[PDB]
Amino acid sequence: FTLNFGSLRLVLEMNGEVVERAEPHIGLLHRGTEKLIEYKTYLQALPYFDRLDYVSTMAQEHAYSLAVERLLNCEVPLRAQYIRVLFCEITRILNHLLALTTHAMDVGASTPFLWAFEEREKLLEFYERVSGARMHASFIRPGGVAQDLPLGLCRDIDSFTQQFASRIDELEEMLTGNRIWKQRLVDIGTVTAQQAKDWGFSGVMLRGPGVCWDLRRAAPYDVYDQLDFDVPVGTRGDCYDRYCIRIEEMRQSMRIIWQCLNKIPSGMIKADDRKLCPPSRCRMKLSMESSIHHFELYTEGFSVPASSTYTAVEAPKGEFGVFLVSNGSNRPYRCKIRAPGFAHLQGLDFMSKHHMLADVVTIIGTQDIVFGEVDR
Amino acid sequence: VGSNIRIDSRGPEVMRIVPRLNEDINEEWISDKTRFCYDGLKRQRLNDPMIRGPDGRFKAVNWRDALSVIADIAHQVKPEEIVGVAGKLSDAESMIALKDFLNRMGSNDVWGEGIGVNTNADFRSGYIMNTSIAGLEKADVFLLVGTQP
C-alpha cells in the first residue's frame, strides 16, 4: 500500500511496515534561481548562491567566486584566501552542527540541539561582526572579500575554538556510545562505494563507504595545500560511521581554523585591479578613475571572457559545483547549480529499501537534505 | 522629412527622443522640434469621447454613444454637404479609412491638410522630391522657389 507524507513530500510503498520503495517529490521549493541568475549580473547573482544550501552559506559564495575567477583569471591576495578558508571552515562547522542536531532530534534526542545552537549563535555573531547579517552574508566576492576583518575577531575565534573543542567532546560523550543511538544508526541505510559512485554521492556520504577521496586534497582550491589537516573515512558506510565522520570533520575544521588564525598574513582583502574589484570609498571619492570604475562596476559588471567551466568545492554537504557559461557580456548566459543534495535524495530510494519509517527519517537526517539547494 | 528617431521611454511616458542613423534621410542629426516634441505628448491630451451638450459644455460618454450620435447625424444630412478633413499628421491607414467611409456615405469631399482646391495630384514625380536627398548631395546648382528649408 502507498502511504503519503506532506517542504518534504514523500510516498512510500509498504508491505509489513517494511519500506519497499520511497519516492520523494521535491519541486515544492523551486524558485527559478537559474533563470534569475541568467537575468541578473554576477554581483547581483551572488546572493542567489547565498540562498542556495542556506545552512552552509559561504561555501556557495566560495564556489561561485572561484568559478568567476576561473573564467576571469584574477589573482586573489593571500590574506583574502586565508580569511575565505577560515570562514569556509566556520561554515562547515555550522552546517555539521545543524545536521547532527537535527538528525538527533529526528531520532529523538532533543537536548544537544540547543547546545549546538548556542555554538551556532556564537558563529553567527562572528558572521554578523565580520559582515552584514548573521545569515546570507554576501561577504565572499570574486577577486577577494567585501571587507576586512574587524579587530578582535581573531581573539574571539580562538576563544570559541577552545570552548568548541570542549563542546565537541561534550556532544560526542552524550551521543556516541549510547545504546539507543547505536541501535538507531548502525546498519541503517548502508551504501557500498560502487553504489555511491553510481549514484553520484559526494562528501561525507561518499567517504562513508570509504572511497578515501576528498575535494580539498584532490583539487586544493585554497591554502588547503598548506594546512595539513585530516580527512576521515568510514570502514563500512552507514549512519553511525557518517555521524562519526561528521564529528571528525568538525574537529579538523577547528584545526584548520586555528592554523588560518595562526598564519594569516597582512595585506589586502581583494583583487588589486579596479576593473574587476570595486575601489574603496576614499579612493572613489578622491580619484577620478576610481570614481569611473566604481560607477561602471556598480551599474554594469565585469565582462568575463566568453567561456564555459565547471568549478566544484567541498561544501559541508558534499561537492557543490557551479557550471558557468558566458558570452562575453556582463550577465551569465547559463548557470547550472549541482548541489550535493540532489544526488543524495536520489540515493534515498535504494538507501531506505527494506527499512522502516524511522529508518527512512534517520536516512534523511544523515543525508542532510536542504531543499533549497535541491530545488535550485 | 520622416527622419528616423529612437524614442526612449520609462514606463507609460516618453522620456526622450534621440536621432538614429539613416544615410538616406538624416545621417545622424535631428531638428529641435523633432528632438523636443515629446513634451507635448503629456499635456492637453484627450482621453475620453465627449459630446457638447445644449449648454455648450462637454460631457464624457461611451464610444458606443459617441459613434451612435455621429452615425445618426451623418444619416440625417444629405450626402452632398458632407466634408472630411485629414489632419497635419495622419497615417495612410487612417486616411484611406476616412476616404472609404465618407465615399460609402455618399460624399466625395475628402481632403488633407495643406492641399489646394486645384492640385494636380496625378503624378508622384509631380509632387515628390525626385532628386532625393542623395541627389541633393550630388547636385551642383539649386533653385529654391516658394520654399524656406
Partner: protein, 330 residues
C-alpha cells in the same frame, strides 16, 4: 464616468471605488471578491472585530481592499466611510432581532440613512441595495415588510438606485442548507414546517454576485429598476430537503410539525429577548420570522425583471452549488 486602466483581473484599476456596507456576511464575500477580481477598489466598512474583514483582505491587490471601522448609528462615521466612495452597495441586514437592533432598525432606518448620505454626497454614481424576494408591504414576515419599506424609501430618496431582490441563497456559508445538514447529522431528522408543501426559488450566491456585477456594469439601463433573482426551477421545501439528504447520502427523516405549534415554540424567544438584558442564542431554525416568511410562497412574479432580462442564466442547484455539503458525508 469610470475609466478602466488595465487588462483586467487582479492588479487593475477598473475606475470603480465601491463601498460595500455589510461586506462581512454571506453575500459580502462573493460581491467583494467579484469587485476585486474586476480590478476595482473595495472599501469594506466593518462593525466590530478587526478580524471580521480579514478574509476580504486577500481577494484584492495591495491597497485595493480597505477596511474601515465605523458605528452604524453614527452619521459622521458613515459619511467618513463613504467619503472616497464612487459606488455604494448595501447588504446590511440580520435574519433575527436583538435587544439593540430590531428588524425595522437594521433594515429600514439603515437603508434610509445610506440613501440620505448617498444623496448628500454627489459623487455616488450607483447605489445597489439588496433585499429579499418576498419583500412586500403585505408580506406576513416583519423582516420582509421592513425590507420592502426600506426598498421603497431608497427608491423615493434616491431614484438613481438599483434594487436586487434575490431569493434564498445557498452556498458554503448559507444559513438554510448548513443548519438543515447540522440538524440531520445531530438528530437524524429535520423539521418540516407545514408538511413542507410551500415553494421557493433558491438561487446560487455566486450567480447573485455576478448579477450584481452585471447591474454595476450596465450602460445606464437599470438606474431605477428592481431585479427579482431566482433559481432555474421552483423547489418545494420538501424537494430541497430531499436534495440535501441525497447530497449527504443519508436517509431522509421528517416530522412535519404544524405551523401553530411551530409558532408557539418560536414565540418565547422574542419576549425573552425584549425582557432580559443578556443576549440569547441566535435562532438557526426555530425562527418566528422564518415561519412567518414560510407562511406564503416566495417565487418570482413573472412581471418584474429577472435573470433572463439581466443577461445571465441561473445555475442549476444539483452539483455546482451543493458541492459544499459533501464535507458534512459519513
Amino acid at each position: 464616468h469610470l475609466v478602466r486602466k488595465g487588462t483586467g483581473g487582479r492588479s487593475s484599476v477598473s475606475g470603480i471605488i465601491a463601498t460595500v456596507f455589510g461586506a462581512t456576511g454571506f453575500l459580502g464575500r462573493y460581491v467583494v471578491q467579484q469587485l476585486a477580481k474586476m480590478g476595482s477598489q473595495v472599501l469594506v466598512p466593518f462593525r466590530g472585530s478587526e478580524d471580521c474583514p480579514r478574509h476580504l483582505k486577500l481577494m484584492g491587490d495591495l491597497g485595493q481592499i480597505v477596511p474601515m471601522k465605523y458605528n452604524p448609528r453614527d452619521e459622521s462615521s458613515v459619511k467618513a466611510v463613504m467619503a472616497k466612495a464612487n459606488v455604494v452597495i448595501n447588504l446590511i441586514g440580520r435574519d433575527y432581532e436583538t435587544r439593540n437592533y430590531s428588524f425595522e432598525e437594521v433594515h429600514y432606518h439603515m437603508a434610509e440613512n445610506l440613501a440620505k448620505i448617498s444623496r448628500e454626497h454627489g459623487g455616488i454614481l450607483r447605489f445597489i441595495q439588496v433585499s429579499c424576494l418576498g419583500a412586500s408591504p403585505s408580506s406576513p414576515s416583519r423582516m420582509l415588510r421592513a425590507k420592502a419599506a426600506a426598498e421603497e424609501v431608497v427608491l423615493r430618496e434616491l431614484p438613481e438606485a438599483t434594487i436586487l431582490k434575490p431569493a434564498v441563497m445557498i452556498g458554503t456559508e448559507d444559513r438554510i442548507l448548513n443548519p438543515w445538514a447540522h440538524f440531520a447529522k445531530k438528530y437524524g431528522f429535520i423539521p418540516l414546517f407545514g408538511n413542507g408543501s410551500t415553494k421557493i426559488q433558491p438561487v446560487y450566491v455566486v450567480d447573485v454576485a455576478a448579477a450584481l456585477t452585471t447591474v454595476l456594469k450596465d450602460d445606464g439601463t437599470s438606474m431605477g429598476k428592481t431585479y427579482e433573482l431566482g433559481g432555474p426551477e421552483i423547489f418545494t421545501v420538501h424537494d430541497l430537503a430531499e436534495l440535501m439528504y441525497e447530497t449527504i447520502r443519508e436517509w431522509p427523516r421528517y416530522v412535519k410539525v404544524p405551523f401553530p405549534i411551530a409558532k408557539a415554540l418560536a414565540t418565547p424567544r422574542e419576549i425573552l429577548l425584549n425582557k432580559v438584558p443578556f443576549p440569547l442564542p441566535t435562532p438557526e431554525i426555530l425562527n418566528l420570522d422564518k415561519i412567518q416568511a414560510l407562511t406564503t410562497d416566495t417565487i418570482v412574479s413573472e412581471n418584474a425583471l429577472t435573470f433572463n432580462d439581466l443577461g445571465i442564466i441561473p445555475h442549476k442547484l444539483k452539483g455546482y452549488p451543493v458541492e459544499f455539503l459533501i464535507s458534512y458525508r459519513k
